[PDB]
Amino acid sequence: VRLYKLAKRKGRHMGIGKRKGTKNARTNQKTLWIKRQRVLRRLLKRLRDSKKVDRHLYHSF
Amino acid sequence: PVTKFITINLSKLTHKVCYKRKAPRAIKEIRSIAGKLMHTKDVRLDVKLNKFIWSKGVRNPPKRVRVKLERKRNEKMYTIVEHVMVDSYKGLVNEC
Amino acid sequence: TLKNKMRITLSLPVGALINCCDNSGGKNLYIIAVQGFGSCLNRLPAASLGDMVLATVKKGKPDLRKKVLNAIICRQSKAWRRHEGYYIYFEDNAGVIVNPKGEMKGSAITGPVARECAELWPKLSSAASAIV
Amino acid sequence: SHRKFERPRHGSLGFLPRKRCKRLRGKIRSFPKDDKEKPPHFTAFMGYKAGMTHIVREVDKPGSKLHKKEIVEACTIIECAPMVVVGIVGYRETPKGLRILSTVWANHVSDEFRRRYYKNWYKSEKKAFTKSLNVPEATKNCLLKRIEKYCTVLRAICHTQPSKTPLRMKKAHIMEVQINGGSMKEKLEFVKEMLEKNLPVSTVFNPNEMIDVISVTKGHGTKGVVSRYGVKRLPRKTHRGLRKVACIGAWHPARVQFQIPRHGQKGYFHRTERNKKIYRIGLKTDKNSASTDADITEKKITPMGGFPHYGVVNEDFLLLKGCVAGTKKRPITLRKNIVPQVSRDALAQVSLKFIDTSSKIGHGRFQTSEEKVKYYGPLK
Amino acid sequence: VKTEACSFSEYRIYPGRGQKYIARDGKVYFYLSSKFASLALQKKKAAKLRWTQTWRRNNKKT
RNA sequence: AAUGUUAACUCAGAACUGAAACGGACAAGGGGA
RNA sequence: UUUGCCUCAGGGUGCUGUAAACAUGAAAGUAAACUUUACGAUCUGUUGAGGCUUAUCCCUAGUGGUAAAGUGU
């Protein structure tokens, strides 16, 4: 199954017929939202660090 | 001892029995055939012989094993089973 | 006009629904009885190609629905033996609406048709559409 | 009270008791009768199970819907390893049945026939029929004069030779075949010639005549009612099983009737098939007896691929309608018919069109070895 | 004797053995036994069917 | 505005191919008036 | 129960069906070097050829074995 993981990264078993769980079962959608919020928020903080964006557009975006 | 060239077909011996007892039935048939053919009552198998017919699994013992069997003088008479291994069995007639 | 009607292989018991394949307006027949069937204890009457079958219509024109009619079962799904050393069998299970005297009530049958009824009732020989 | 739905019973009482047959050969209860006018010739035969096969034909029955059109039928071809005639038996009628006046053996006898009189032949001294074949002919002449003066039914002990067949059995099957025909005065001379030689079937067997087949059916051991008599299976909800007869009789009489189907032995019964018309006469050595001048291929009685559980056939053949009972390697007995008829198919002359040669084991592809070889040719 | 040729395969037909399969369209389809009809019945291709002479004709191995 | 180190499993379309059949076993709602 | 029989083998009819390898072959198309180089469900030619085929298939004076004769009359 090491070779099988390589083959799934290769893209053969990408069929819709190896999925025995729902979308949220494989990966937690709330955790995905948390990760996305963290990764965009780190950028939002770095924009204030570099002062590339003003606060007026910073609270907007 | 006596020089003889034959083989044994365990397929025709375990043909009727279920998977659960195919290998022990093969063992029993080997013992019975050895004793009957060699006119002795004390036939002792070999650990290698048990290995060979148990390795393939209980469901399917090996089909056929070649017999060229030798006795032993030390009631008095007793035999130990042995086997001949060869790639192809076709063309190898029975003889002395 | 002779009733030398030849061996038949038995299939299609009572309670089977089959195709119609004719311009009579019906779609599927529902076998309720066949004629010539005698008395056996638990035997279900079943259809023979050369035998009229009492049948109802489940889908089709309301004119011929809600009542019993006679149908000649034409195309079987079971191999019927023949002296020709070879059976005959089909995929579609089919029958054609006929009057009790024997003649077909439709005008043409889409699929292949049975030739025995052509001489069993002379008015089916003329209307035989495409015999196998 | 009465049954609401009267239906025919299960099985026939005429084949009771459904018990294992005592012997393996097919005995004959009755031989075809005799007439003074008809001429003295043979009355029965015997052989083995060569084949119950098809043949293609054309009906000549007036008004038939097939008639001129080619048809396929079902007939049989018999295995006849010639039987050795060894003995003569005389019977005379008495108010207690027909009683044996005497039997006379041929002055020379075969070893296969004598082997039947033993259970352990390999260990015996083979002393049977040793000093009983050295009798003077004065005794024979006196006893045959007695046979003519007193006896009225004449039978011939004939034995088969299983050595010709591939059977493991080495004992010979022995039976007696009646001789039917004219009065005693002609009969005495007509039974003075064939007393030692083997029996060719084509001697009397002729086309357009009816025969019957006697045999012992197959064996299946003990079987339930649903198999022995084909009783209706009880519904799945039944408590103590469903493969049994529900009611085996009313309250009265307070006994089980003998008509009630019960479990027991099925098969290994005595069977006789009647109205089996013989159609054609052939041989074993010849090469075109089974085939026709409209078939113009090569073949003899030889089969293809061997016979499953029967070996190969190297003996005579004839033709006769129908199929047979019994199993493979089972002895079959052939009788003539009892009362010949004058109906249309009773007197109908017949003729075949094509003869099977194929691989009679299951679904094969090649009818002849020559065809199989030619159709491929260059191979591995 | 005269024996017709098979439809799916190329073997002659011997009366006394066969059957007849016919589809909806009513065309005659003559074969020899249940396999010789079922190979066609299972909607398979004689070109792919290795063990028939049709495959040999398709793969020029005469 | 760009170039280097290092950790995901979610999608999508072109193939041909395999006995035109595939949550391949285990695991699992029959629906409707 | 020794012109046998058991076993084995030469086959035979068969059953699925194409079997063990070769590929400076194709092999959907993939990636690494200055045209060649690492995989790729299969087939192609040897391959209408293997594996199994009586234990209840068929043939073979083919060869190995075929044994103690204990009981009753």
Which chains border A (3 or more CB–CB pairs < 8 Å)? none
Is the Cβ pair E24, C91 closer than 8 Å? yes
The single-letter code of the amino acid at A61 is F
- Cβ-contact E35, E53 below 8 angstroms: no
DSSP β-bridge partners for residue D335: D44, D212
Element (H or E) spanning B67, and its range?
strand B64-67
Distance, in angstroms, between C41 CA and closest chain D CA? Answer: 6
| C-alpha triplet D288, D293, D294: angle, nearest 5° | 130
Beta bridge partner(s), residue D51: D77
Nearest to D64 among C4, C42, C84 (CB): C4
- Per-residue H/E/C for chain D: CCCCCCCCCCCCHHHCCCCCCCCCCCCCCCCCCCCCCCCCEECEEEEEEEECCEEEECCCCCCCCCCCCCEEEEEEEEEECCEEEEEEEEEEEEECEEEEEEEEECCCCCHHHHHCCCCCCCCCCCCCCCCCCCCCHHHHHHHHHHHHHHCCEEEEEEECCCCCCCCCCCCCCEEEEEEECCCHHHHHHHCCCCCCCEECHHHCCCCCEEEEEEEECCEEEEECHHHHCCCCCCCCCCCCCCCCCCCCCCCCCCCCCCCCCCCEEEECCEEEEEEEEEEEECCCCCCCCCCCCCCCCCCCCCCCCCECCCECCCCECEEEECCCCCCCCCCEEEEECCCCCCCCCCCCCCCCCECCCCCCCCCCCCCCHHHHHHHHCCCC
A14 touches strand F (CB under 7 A): yes
Query: Quick one: closest CA in D to E35, which residue?
Result: D363
Backbone φ and ψ of A10, nearest 5°: -65, -35
User: Can you list the pairs that C107-112 forms with residues at least 24 positions away whose Cβ atoms lie under 8 Å?
Assistant: C107/C22, C107/C23, C108/C22, C108/C23, C109/C21, C109/C22, C109/C74, C110/C21, C110/C22, C111/C21, C111/C74, C111/C75, C111/E24, C111/E26, C112/C74, C112/C75, C112/E22, C112/E26
Residue D153 to residue D98: CA distance in whole angstroms: 8
Q: Around Cβ B16, how many Cβ atoms within 10 Å?
A: 8
CB neighbours of residue C62 within 10 Å: 8
Question: With an 8 Å Cβ cutoff, are C83 and D5 in contact?
Answer: no
Which technique? cryo-EM
The span from the CA of C60 to the CA of B71, in Å, is: 87
- The DSSP-derived string for B7-56 is EEESHHHHSSS-GGGHHHHHHHHHHHHHHHHHT-SEEE--HHHHHHHHHT
How near does any CA of chain D get to the CA of C112, in Å? 22
Which residue type, as a one-letter code, is found at position B30? I
**CA separation for the pair A16, D91 (Å, rounded):** 91
> Closest Cα partner for C108 from C92, C129, C93?
C129
Tokens (6 digits) for B11: 């397929």
Chains that touch C (3 or more CB pairs under 8 A): D, E
- Two structure tokens written together for E42: 């299972």
**Residue C98 CA to its chain's centroid (Å):** 9
CB under 8 Å to D21, separation ≥6 — which residues? D216, D268, D269, D270
Chain E residues with CB-CB distance to D367 below 8 A: 14
Residue C59, helix vs strand vs coil: strand
Rounded Cα gap, residues B36 and B26, in angstroms:
15
- Cβ-in-10-Å burial (0-12, 13-18, 19+) of A20 comes to exposed
Whose structure tokens read 């004598």? D114
Geometric angle at alpha carbon B58, from B53 and B60, rounded to 5°: 75
Q: Which of D189, D198, D201, D163 is nearest to D79 (CA)?
A: D201
